[PDB]
Ligand binder design. Structure first.
Ligand SMILES: CN1CC[C@H](C(=O)O)[C@@H](c2ccccc2)c2cc(Br)ccc21
Length: 134
């Protein structure tokens, strides 16, 4: 498994636990409803150690870029400003966020040709499955 194999445009086909993960983050109702109903595409690009992830939908689009292994300020969809680090480790892209004494991890991995995105904060989890599209 390599970080490059995650590259491309992917479209959301299934979600579980997302609303509860947003509740654990303390996301307010406006943003939770938009999350309930955006069916985004996730676009992953990686050039050596440079990574960009763009999550795109008519409701909401976010994008960040980083260097793998280097701490950076991420503005999240819900407007947190986190200190994030992304690494490709044990065959998954692991995005670790720390802010105001709190932490959350988002992992992205290939499983059976699908992109599986898993979020966790304080044992509250979400799992989102994306299929590779043109
Ligand atoms: C870190 N991600 C992972 C989960 C979601 C995804 O990429 O499918 C993502 C998101 C972004 C734009 C539109 C809908 C959902 C999201 C939304 C939010 Br409100 C908080 C974190 C978060």
């Amino acid at each position: 498994a390599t970080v490059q194999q995650l590259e491309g445009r992917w479209r959301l086909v299934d979600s579980k636990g997302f609303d509860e993960y947003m509740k654990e983050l303390g996301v307010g109702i406006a943003l939770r409803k938009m999350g309930a109903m955006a069916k985004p595409d996730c676009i992953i690009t990686c050039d050596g150690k440079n990574l960009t992830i763009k999550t795109e939908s008519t409701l909401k689009t976010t994008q960040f870029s980083c260097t793998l292994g280097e701490k950076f300020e991420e503005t999240t969809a819900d407007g947190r400003k986190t200190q994030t680090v992304c690494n490709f480790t044990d065959g998954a892209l692991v995005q670790h966020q720390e802010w105001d004494g709190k932490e959350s991890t988002i992992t992205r991995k290939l499983k059976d040709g699908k992109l599986v995105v898993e979020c966790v904060m304080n044992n509250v989890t979400c799992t989102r499955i994306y299929e590779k599209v043109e």
